[PDB]
């Protein structure tokens, strides 16, 4: 089943690989693609420990902080810390009440996308160290504890291997019943200081090349629902049967709800009732307002729009602001993740740009700046390129001021 995930939404936080805090509890300045926000980082660590202790009895987390302070980044870091394949479903409340569909159905699907299934199934795969890659019926030698095995593959399987960038001395498993090659990594024989055991330089497979590997498929309920197209309930029953059999271990994810202040009180009640259940995922809010009025009441004003009932069961985690240094560091990290070479003076100008408007604006400015630099035949971005890009594209605040100023 095709994975149904908004790759674009989380693509901006791809550098985040975890919460980056030590065993003691305090957080280092920079680790796992996370810079600053030490207090919120420790709070998130505490929440992670609570979740793993199953002490989140009918509770949620509210991340309060100004725009562009990594609320979504912190939620993604929490999701990563609970597990690399733990589901993460970000969503802004402004799109619950779409013109069509139904608020209940939108929240329903959002909740579904946050509940995963660890389907571990034993399939005989071709887990072996590629010794040679002869493409003729593609008899590729897979040396393992048993030895090299000239297992005849198919041109489609060879194309799949090429898509996985599998080369010589690459310990890969080729699930035989489905003919899918998945690059596990290289061999431990070439392990160096950075290349280590049981990673992209995975050690030599111990056992026969054709081994029944307990492969775990990470898939959430919603993907199954879209695959089977009431119908929704029927998918639930099959999932329950799967778990009962003893191969589907449920793993609750994280549901990140941004712009919570603009959610109906009915939606708040629905979320409360959903989080009441034990199987429910952790519901993490995020807001930028103060004591803004509740949406569907018009007279009761409560912190961050949340009604007092839910908000009595909420752990507020405050997010701080970034000083020029942190902004520059984060911009450089994002540029590195994008493959962008940028000068330090350009990074400084980008940091002061972000300080005025937002981190979002500074990060977005990178791509057009790199394209402009490429057009002029330069491999790097200089301060002049950033100046020109800032003079070309504006930000909401400044453009609104320009429009009002003339008025």
């Amino acid at each position: 089943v095709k994975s149904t995930t908004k790759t674009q939404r989380i693509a901006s936080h791809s550098h985040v690989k975890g919460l980056g805090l030590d065993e003691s509890g305090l957080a280092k300045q920079a680790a796992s693609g996370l810079v600053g926000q030490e207090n919120a980082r420790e709070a998130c660590g505490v929440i992670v420990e609570l979740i793993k202790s199953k002490k989140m009895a009918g509770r949620a987390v509210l991340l309060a902080g100004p725009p562009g302070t990594g609320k979504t980044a912190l939620a993604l870091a929490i999701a990563q810390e609970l597990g690399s394949k733990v589901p993460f479903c970000p969503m802004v409340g402004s799109e619950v009440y779409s013109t069509e569909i139904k608020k209940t159905e939108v929240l329903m699907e959002n909740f579904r996308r946050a509940i995963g299934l660890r389907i571990k199934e034993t399939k005989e795969v071709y887990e072996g160290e590629v010794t040679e890659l002869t493409p003729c019926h593609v008899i590729i030698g897979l040396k393992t504890a048993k030895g090299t095995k000239q297992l005849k593959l198919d041109p489609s399987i060879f194309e799949s291997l090429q898509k996985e960038r599998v080369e010589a001395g690459d310990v890969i498993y080729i699930e035989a019943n489905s003919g899918a090659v998945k690059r596990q990594g290289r061999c431990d024989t070439y392990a160096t200081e950075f290349d280590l055991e049981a990673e992209e330089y995975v050690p030599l497979p111990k056992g026969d090349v054709h081994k029944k590997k307990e492969i775990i498929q990470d898939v959430t309920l919603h993907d199954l629902d879209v695959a089977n197209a009431k119908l929704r309930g029927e998918i639930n029953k099959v999932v329950n049967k799967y778990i009962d059999q003893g191969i589907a271990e449920l793993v609750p994810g994280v549901l990140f709800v941004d712009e919570v202040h603009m959610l109906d009180i009915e939606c708040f009640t629905y979320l409360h009732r959903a989080l009441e259940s034990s199987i429910a995922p952790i519901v993490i809010f995020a807001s930028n307002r103060g004591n803004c009025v509740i949406r569907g009441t018009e007279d009761i004003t409560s912190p961050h729009g949340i009604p007092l009932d839910l908000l009595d069961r909420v752990m507020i985690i405050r997010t701080m602001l970034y000083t020029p240094q942190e902004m520059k560091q984060i911009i450089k990290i994002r540029a590195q993740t994008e493959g962008i070479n940028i000068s330090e003076e350009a990074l400084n100008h980008l940091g002061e740009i972000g300080t005025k408007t937002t981190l979002r604006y500074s990060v977005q400015l990178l791509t057009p700046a790199n394209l402009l630099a490429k057009i002029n035949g330069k491999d790097s971005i200089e301060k002049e390129h950033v100046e020109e890009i800032s003079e070309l594209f504006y930000d909401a605040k400044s453009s609104a001021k320009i429009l009002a100023d003339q008025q």
Binding site: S24, G25, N39, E42, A43, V46, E49, L50, K55, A57, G58, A64, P66, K103, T104, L107, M108, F111, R112, I115, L221, D225, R232, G233, I235, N236, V239, N240, I265, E266, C267, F268, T269, Y270, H272, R273, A274, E276, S277, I279, A280, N288, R289, G290, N291, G296, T297, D299, I300, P303, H304, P307, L308, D309, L311, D312, M315, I316, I317, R318
Partner: protein, 386 residues
């Protein structure tokens, strides 16, 4: 689940004289006296066609007093605590939400014969046997490894009341009688429980009316026969001001029935416009319902009662606190809500365990205070930003 599971009664002694600290309640003597008056009014049956609304600022035990009254009415009297905003829900209309809330409070005590495997343990025999003595006879009643582990979990070897092929209970070492106490356990099942029974990711992926009618008919039949015993409980609606005029009319209609449970509401606004209509009224309640309302006001909390409450709560959460930590938590609970103070405790426990300690210090309390913001601070800090 959980919350304030430490009060098993109002604690007002006799003749409406609250004995300060008792079964949880450690304050609000006026409110406790009023709640006792209301309870014994209910017992004598002259509260028909009335309701109780408990006013007071947040964190003064409005729900605690209602839970205490529910416990004092009976050891198994149903208690249903919902919120005013709880009814405007996406699945159910306010009609269905309030109907479910009412039926949650109407409890049915129905007898059910059961062969509780009980006997006064004379020797703790270890899967294996376990000597048990009763007035009927004495013999080595066999138990499993987990059953004996639970027997050691309870005080050994007082008891134990081991229900049939089930868990045990500490009494004394003295439950006696028959080794087969074929006791018809009077299970208190609320109307809503039976309704749901007749009707595991259902919440992630409402009952028609026929199931409801069948439930009513069957329950009435059992109660008439003498098998069941309809015992109206207490229904608590926090944030009553959130309710609108239409739900208030349905509440008025439902209070007219004979099965109606004692209705308790809590509000902290005063002189607030009714959610429906455009007319200001005290606590946002239409006067038709305010006329027949017994109003109880919970006074704000003082330092010593707050500290006692915190002591009880830490006793419940298996946390040892330093006296300086207790004073700082008390001052926090006075400057902020009690709820935030209670929240602080669990986080401080994990902070203490991070440094591999046994008792939480003041340093952990301050670290967790800096970690998690409370209601007032977060707003102040946000608006200043804007």
């Amino acid at each position: 689940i959980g919350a304030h599971s430490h009060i098993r009664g109002l604690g007002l002694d006799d003749a409406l004289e609250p004995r300060q600290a008792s079964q949880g309640m450690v304050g609000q003597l006026a409110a406790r006296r009023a709640a006792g008056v209301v309870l014994e009014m209910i017992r004598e049956g002259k509260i028909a066609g009335r309701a109780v609304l408990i006013a007071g600022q947040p964190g003064t035990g409005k729900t605690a007093i209602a839970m205490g009254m529910a416990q004092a009415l009976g050891p198994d009297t149903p208690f249903t605590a919902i919120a005013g905003s709880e009814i405007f829900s996406l699945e159910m209309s306010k009609t269905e939400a309030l109907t479910q809330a009412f039926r949650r409070s109407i409890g049915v005590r129905i007898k059910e014969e059961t062969e509780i495997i009980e006997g006064e343990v004379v020797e703790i025999q270890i899967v294996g046997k376990l000597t048990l003595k009763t007035t009927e006879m004495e013999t080595i009643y066999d138990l499993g490894t987990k059953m004996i582990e639970s027997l050691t979990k309870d005080k050994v070897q007082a008891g134990d009341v081991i229900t049939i092929d089930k868990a045990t209970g500490k009494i004394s070492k003295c439950p006696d009688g028959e080794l087969q106490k074929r006791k018809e356990v009077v299970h208190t099942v609320s109307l809503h429980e039976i309704d749901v029974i007749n009707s595991f990711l259902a919440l992630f992926s409402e009952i028609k009316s026929e199931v409801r009618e069948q439930i009513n008919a069957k329950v009435a039949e059992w109660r008439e026969e003498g098998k069941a015993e309809i015992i109206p409980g207490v229904l608590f609606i926090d944030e009553v001001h959130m309710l609108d005029i239409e739900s208030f009319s349905f509440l008025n209609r439902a209070l007219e029935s004979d099965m109606a449970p004692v209705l308790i509401m809590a509000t902290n606004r005063g002189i607030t416009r009714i959610r429906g209509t455009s007319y200001q009224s005290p606590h946002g309640i239409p006067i038709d319902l305010l006329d027949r309302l017994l109003i109880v006001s919970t006074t704000p909390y003082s330092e010593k009662d707050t500290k006692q409450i915190l002591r009880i709560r830490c006793e419940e959460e298996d946390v040892e606190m330093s006296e300086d930590a207790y004073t700082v938590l008390t001052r926090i609970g006075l400057e902020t809500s009690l709820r935030y103070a209670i929240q602080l405790i669990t986080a401080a426990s994990l902070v203490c365990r991070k440094r591999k300690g046994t008792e939480v210090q003041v340093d952990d309390i301050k670290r967790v205070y800096s970690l998690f913001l409370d209601e007032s601070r977060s707003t102040q800090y946000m608006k200043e930003y804007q």
